[PDB]
């Protein structure tokens, strides 16, 4: 049956978007939630709402009973997943073909093939993307990986063909680490999820990241809607990404162009998704993945391109015919902000606490969307993510003008936060482009900018005073007298 | 000679929304404020901010000196007009040049020939600007108004020539009226602007109001940066924008941008403007407005089209050569809403009151040009609107399924708003055209809404101090033990 009630099969910020999504397509929306969750913008946005109990994923989300429980009782009708989370189960998409609702996710026979990131490999290949120098087959041991840098030079990268999730994947600077760091990927393969297909390519120093955003039909036809440079992460992971890059050459940006779509057909994918590029400073683009999931940042691809990237997973999972057929034109330039709920002062080290006050941007090309609201109290229990910043202009400068009040007029108090940070990002000559290069690198923070906050550790009168008329405010001790 | 330190002297949303270009800009940004706003998000929001005193708007922000005084102070080498107030006054376009500071706006000429909508008229005439014909100089008394009637047939609009705000007009549909109209007319006319220069036209039964953007150089360039539609009204007054503007074909638009292009010429014009029409149900271009103050509409604009708009006039009054110099092409449709403090299940009568609470809606494809805070106070001592709403999709489905999303969620309490309003009619299906054609017409609203909405039920202390014998009024609040 076509796509009538939907349900979320996810939490987190998307669980959120995925309700501005349902409540305006105006049908009845549902969506589970952790005891945490219970009281969350979505959970309480939500026409419907059903408990999963615990206060940890492996608790709640993850696990098939409580899912299939709300699948019944819910009485929905599609079944959306999100990133992270379950949206990346083939044997998920076939539950829900089992339960006759609409996958809103590519088919489950695209999903384990891509899933084996061996057959993604073999789907980039024969596809002919833009490729590293990388074996097809996983190799045996350290010392002929010592062998492979003697012939191809070094540093070498190994990744797993199986698992994620930031894990799974180590590298060799010189071939005197091989001995022990092939068997440091592997020991960590296996002691997080068991398998050993692990594989190795020639690796890139300084490295870059850019994501090409894909809507693809059921009945198999494709409309490519723009690109992501990511190059500002912590520890590798997202913080701060930007769309249009200014400074990719145009030949390669067809290249990106044409080498998605030649991944795409191969891997047979369909929905609504992304396929990834590991990108070099030396010119060279590499195919690096195709998520297989949605993404935090799909807003900069759709106000670049001006169309919405969330309601094609719904008309291509309908599978009614697609209405668009060729890659729009271009607009300006933007900016993506993560928050996260880190002590940005001593490496990010995963911090808890409450928002106890929170203030949103507003007026013109400054946009957000807020996983947390004023009383969620924050901890390790899943992934730091807290909000959407979004910043547009006519180029890179003037987004760099506008996150300065995005990070003025936003602000939390209570927890620590990249809020501090982000403006010396912003602000940094070695950040801002020059016109002819980026400067900004995968782990940049943590491998060459100099980070500048303080780590994280009665009441103060505040009082106004006006001198000539000059409005001024004024802190005073709790015990000013005399 | 440059733009330095922005002073923007207005109450509200436009303070708030020019302040935050200037944040934007990295401007240097000074705010003044009265008592009710000592505390206002404008006030806290600016770098710097200056009391104008008193306790309304009329005690305070009409007088020059109380703002050019309060410029000096700061050093706001730059004033801005805004909208209201004295945005649209050729004495502050003097005062500000004889002070010696950056006027963001038009020449003095450039205001003095578009405060008088009289004046753009008969520019209009000589421009062959599509007309409400009438005639381009009025006539000249009602003895002529009973023959001119007579002559061209009733209905008739009886106006005074600077009736602006939808409040300065009449219409008559019967010859033995239009007497009365116009002595009403011309009585509170000069009750209200002491001026009695009023003129008379022929009516239009279904008018629909549009008007383009127009950004013209000090070397010369002039670009046609967008359209907007305002059709959705109340008690004759603009409360929603769609843009670019819709139910127009190239036919329409083609006059309404060459004309804009002759009318700005003919007009000498540079800086920034807009040219505004009433297209007929039948799609027949009238005439009613050049406008030269930034209009409120503005979001829209500032969403479809690739311009902080206030930041291209920034460089406009910093005499560069427009960096924007071709027509542009406006992405899709939007939608913009005024969140005025009115009780819809009261008639719209004004309601004010304590902000005790305000959400205002967040995310892609909807906007906010929020104006005022939670805990803050409303009233009619100042302007009417709490905020605005601003929608935008890939085109008007899309943007309406978001505006009866974006209305579902705006929440206010503590006062009545029109929010609940704006979701009736974002629900009404007149204003949900088949593509060819749409029904919505003026009057719509106040003929054929269907209306569903519930009935809701120290001071400071001035010290003088002295240094060295100079005087400096310092002000305290009247506890501080």
């Given at each position: ?5 939907v349900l ?9 978007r995925?309700?501005?999504?349902a ?9 589970v939630?952790?005891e945490p969750?219970a009281?969350a ?5 939500a ?5 999963l109990?615990?206060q940890?994923?492996?608790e ?6 409580k899912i299939l ?10 079944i959306h997943?999100?990133?992270g989370?379950l949206?990346e189960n083939a044997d ?7 339960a006759?609702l ?5 088919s489950?026979?695209?999903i384990?093939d891509?899933?084996?990131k ?12 833009p490729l590293?120098?990388?074996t ?15 012939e191809?030079?070094v ?5 797993a063909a199986f698992?994620?999730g930031?894990?799974?994947?180590k590298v060799?600077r010189?071939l ?5 760091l092939?068997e440091?990927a ?9 398998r050993?297909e692990?594989?190795?390519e ?8 850019v994501?090409a955003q894909v809507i693809?039909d059921?009945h ?5 809607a723009g690109?992501?440079?990511c190059?500002l ?12 890059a200014p400074?990719?050459?145009d ?6 162009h044409?080498?998605a779509?030649?991944?795409c ?5 369909y929905?609504?998704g992304t396929?990834?590029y590991?990108?070099?400073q030396?010119?060279?683009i590499s195919?690096l993945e195709v998520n ?13 391109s001006?169309?919405d ?11 009614e015919?697609?209405?668009?057929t ?6 300006g330039?933007?900016?993506?902000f993560r ?7 001593r490496?990010?080290?995963?911090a ?7 203030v949103?941007?507003t007026?013109p ?9 004023t009383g ?7 992934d730091?993510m807290?909000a959407?910043?979004i910043?547009?202009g006519?180029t890179?400068?003037?987004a760099l003008?506008r ?7 936003f602000?939390?108090?209570g927890?620590?936060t990249?809020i501090?940070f982000?403006?010396a990002?912003?602000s940094?000559?070695a950040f801002?482009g ?11 923070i943590e491998?060459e900018?100099?980070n500048t906050?303080?780590?994280f550790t009665v009441?103060?009168?505040?009082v106004v005073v006006?001198?000539g ?6 802190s005073?001790?709790?015990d000013l007298?005399?």
């Amino acid at each position: 049956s076509k796509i009538s009630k939907v349900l979320v099969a996810n939490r987190g910020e998307i669980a959120v978007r995925v309700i501005r999504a349902a409540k305006d397509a105006g049908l009845a929306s549902v969506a589970v939630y952790a005891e945490p969750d219970a009281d969350a913008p979505h959970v309480r946005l939500a026409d419907e709402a059903f408990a999963l109990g615990g206060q940890t994923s492996a608790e709640s989300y993850l696990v098939f009973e409580k899912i299939l429980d709300a699948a019944e009782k819910s009485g929905a009708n599609a079944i959306h997943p999100g990133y992270g989370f379950l949206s990346e189960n083939a044997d998920f998409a076939q539950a829900v073909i089992d339960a006759g609702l609409i996958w809103i996710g590519p088919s489950p026979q695209s999903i384990r093939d891509l899933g084996d990131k061996v057959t993604a490999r073999h789907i980039a290949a024969r596809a002919k993307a833009p490729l590293v120098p990388g074996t097809p087959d996983p190799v045996k041991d350290a010392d002929e990986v010592v062998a492979f840098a003697k012939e191809h030079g070094v540093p070498v990268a190994i990744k797993a063909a199986f698992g994620g999730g930031g894990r799974g994947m180590k590298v060799a600077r010189t071939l005197e680490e091989i001995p022990e760091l092939f068997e440091s990927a592997t020991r960590e393969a296996i002691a997080a999820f068991g398998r050993g297909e692990c594989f190795v390519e020639r690796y890139l120093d300084k490295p870059r990241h850019v994501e090409a955003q894909v809507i693809a039909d059921q009945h198999g036809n494709v409309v490519v809607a723009g690109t992501r440079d990511c190059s500002l992460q912590r520890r590798f992971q997202k913080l701060v990404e930007e769309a249009p890059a200014p400074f990719l050459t145009d030949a390669q940006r067809k290249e990106i162009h044409e080498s998605a779509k030649r991944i795409c057909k191969e891997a047979g994918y369909y929905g609504a998704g992304t396929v990834e590029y590991l990108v070099g400073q030396d010119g060279l683009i590499s195919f690096l993945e195709v998520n297989t999931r949605l993404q935090v940042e799909h807003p900069v691809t759709e106000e670049t391109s001006g169309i919405d990237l969330v309601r094609q997973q719904f008309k291509i999972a309908n599978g009614e015919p697609l209405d668009i057929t060729e890659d729009p034109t271009p607009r300006g330039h933007s900016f993506e902000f993560r928050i996260n709920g880190e002590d940005a002062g001593r490496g990010f080290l995963p911090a808890p606490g409450p928002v106890t006050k929170f203030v949103a941007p507003t007026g013109p090309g400054v946009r957000m969307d807020s996983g947390v609201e004023t009383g969620s109290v924050i901890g390790g229990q899943f992934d730091s993510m807290l909000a959407k910043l979004i910043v547009t202009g006519a180029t890179r400068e003037e987004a760099l003008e506008r996150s300065r009040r995005a990070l003025a007029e936003f602000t939390v108090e209570g927890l620590a936060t990249v809020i501090p940070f982000h403006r010396a990002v912003v602000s940094d000559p070695a950040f801002i482009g020059d016109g002819e290069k980026f400067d900004v690198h995968t782990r940049w923070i943590e491998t060459e900018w100099n980070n500048t906050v303080e780590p994280f550790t009665v009441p103060r009168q505040t009082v106004v005073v006006e001198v000539g008329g000059r409005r001024l405010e004024v802190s005073l001790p709790g015990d000013l007298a005399i």
